[PDB]
Amino acid sequence: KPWWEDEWEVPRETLKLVERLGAGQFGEVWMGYYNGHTKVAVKSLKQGSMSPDAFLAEANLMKQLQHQRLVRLYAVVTQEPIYIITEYMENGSLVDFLKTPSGIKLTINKLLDMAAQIAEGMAFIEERNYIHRDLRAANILVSDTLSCKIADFGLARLIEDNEYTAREGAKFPIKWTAPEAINYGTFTIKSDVWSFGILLTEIVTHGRIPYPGMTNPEVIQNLERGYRMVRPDNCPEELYQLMRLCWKERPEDRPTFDYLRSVLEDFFTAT
Numbered sequence: 001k002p003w004w005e006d007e008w009e010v011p012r013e014t015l016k017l018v019e020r021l022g023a024g025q026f027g028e029v030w031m032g033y034y035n036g037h038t039k040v041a042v043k044s045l046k047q048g049s050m051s052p053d054a055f056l057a058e059a060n061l062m063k064q065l066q067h068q069r070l071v072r073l074y075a076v077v078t079q080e081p082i083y084i085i086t087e088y089m090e091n092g093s094l095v096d097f098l099k100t101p102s103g104i105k106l107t108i109n110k111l112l113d114m115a116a117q118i119a120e121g122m123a124f125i126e127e128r129n130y131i132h133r134d135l136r137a138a139n140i141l142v143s144d145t146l147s148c149k150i151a152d153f154g155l156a157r158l159i160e161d162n163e164y165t166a167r168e169g170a171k172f173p174i175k176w177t178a179p180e181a182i183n184y185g186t187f188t189i190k191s192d193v194w195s196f197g198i199l200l201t202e203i204v205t206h207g208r209i210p211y212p213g214m215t216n217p218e219v220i221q222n223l224e225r226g227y228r229m230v231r232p233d234n235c236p237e238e239l240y241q242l243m244r245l246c247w248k249e250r251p252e253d254r255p256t257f258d259y260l261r262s263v264l265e266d267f268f269t270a271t
């Protein structure tokens with residue numbers, strides 16, 4: 001729908017930007033209020049830095065992926081400077097939150113709870129025929145009640161035929177991305193499953209970088225030999241074997257996110 005019929009469009013006047021949370025090459029992220037009372041995150045596009053079409057594509061996708069476990073699109077302002085307004089997540093990114101004094105004190109039981117919550121959001125994405133492609137602890141946000149939601153849908157795509165193929169000059173973080181996506185640019189929900197295994201390491205290490213002490217070429221080399229990431233310190237062997245399932249050589253041998261969810265819920269209720 002055009003902006004004057006779009007239910008997400010709001011007049012810019014409804015928003016007050018209060019605190020800047022980040023600034024980057026492509027704009028800024030702010031904590032703000034809608035109509036005085038409702039706390040929201042506001043992402044603004046820096047004019048000229050990237051296409052306004054490209055920027056808004058993320059909001060359009062979010063219109064199609066609404067679930068409790070996914071950061072919700074709140075509103076858009078589609079006149080420059082373009083805003084994308086989203087659900088405010090009080091405890092920020094999981095990667096940062098696990099390092100705070102609150103995050104540090106979480107038990108393995110709660111970390112397994114959080115992993116299941118993330119699997120639950122990914123299972124919805126999977127059921128809807130989408131892929132995320134940027135699944136990592138930096139892209140999980142944490143609420144004031146210590147619940148987790150999937151965020152950052154910039155790379156997310158609707159799948160028609162199982163598989164999205166990026167351009168052959170496209171680069172993705174080596175440590176988090178499935179080998180077939182790095183090698184061939186071919187992404188499926190099974191690529192996100194591999195990333196989820198990497199994300200589990202970030203959960204259990206309180207946000208430490210995957211593949212301790214290795215460069216990207218070393219990671220690629222070890223993987224091709226059939227090694228997987230070394231058991232993280234203080235990782236329950238159960239969780240480590242679940243990570244390994246995520247890291248199966250053949251994408252189709254990797255489990256579904258529904259399976260991951262159900263297993264992690266069992267892990268959680270046991271602990």
Ligand SMILES: O=C(CSc1n[nH]c(=O)n1-c1ccc(OCc2ccccc2)cc1)c1ccc(Cl)cc1
Nearest residue numbers: 021029041043086087088089090091092093096152
């Ligand atoms: O990158 C971001 C911004 S994060 C972000 N987006 N949405 C949201 O709620 N946060 C968030 C919330 C609280 C927060 O504060 C915790 C904190 C305090 C001090 C120091 C460090 C953390 C930080 C981020 C983003 C990504 C996608 C989108 Cl759609 C919007 C923003």
